[PDB]
Amino acid sequence: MEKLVQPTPLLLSLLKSAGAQKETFTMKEVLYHLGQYIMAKQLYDEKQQHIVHCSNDPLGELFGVQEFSVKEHRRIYAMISRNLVS
Ligand SMILES: CC1=N[C@@](C)(c2ccc(Cl)cc2)[C@@](C)(c2ccc(Cl)cc2)N1C(=O)N1CCN(CCCS(C)(=O)=O)CC1
């Protein structure tokens, strides 16, 4: 079986805000809902479509960054791991 992960309170609140309805997830599911949140809040750069702007959004505090690229997968996994129950 795939390992299920357990978001800490802030990340959990974001994921539910995007439509998640449980407390544990596969990493694929966490990433899906995070992607939905980003799309819904229109955080993508208009011209460089892989760039996500967080400086005006609570996601910035959650991840601890001002911008990131969706191509930086190791970085995104790291940002999520800091917000999982160990
Ligand atoms: C762009 C994109 N890549 C994904 C698959 C991704 C999977 C894993 C990892 Cl580590 C990183 C990225 C994902 C799911 C995502 C997931 C999490 C985050 Cl933080 C951002 C994006 N994603 C996504 O949600 N979207 C939103 C933007 N859409 C843009 C479509 C427009 S077009 C012209 O390209 O058809 C499609 C992809």
Q: Judge if the beta carbon of residue 70 lies within 6 A of ligand 1.
A: yes
For residue 15, what is the enclosing H or E element? helix 9-17
Neighbour count for residue 81 (Cβ, 10 Å): 11
Distance of CA 85 from the midpoint of ligand 1 (Å): 24
Residue 19: which of 31, 5, 37 has the closest Cα?
37
Distance of CA 41 from the midpoint of ligand 1 (Å): 14
> Resolution in A, one decimal?
1.6
Tokens for 73, please give them. 């997968």
Positive or negative, the CA dihedral 57, 61, 59, 72 is positive
Distance CA 50, CA 47 (A): 9
Architecture of domain 1-86: Orthogonal Bundle (1.10)
Tokens for 56, please give them. 């005006």
Name the residue ranges covered by the structural domains of the chain: 1-86
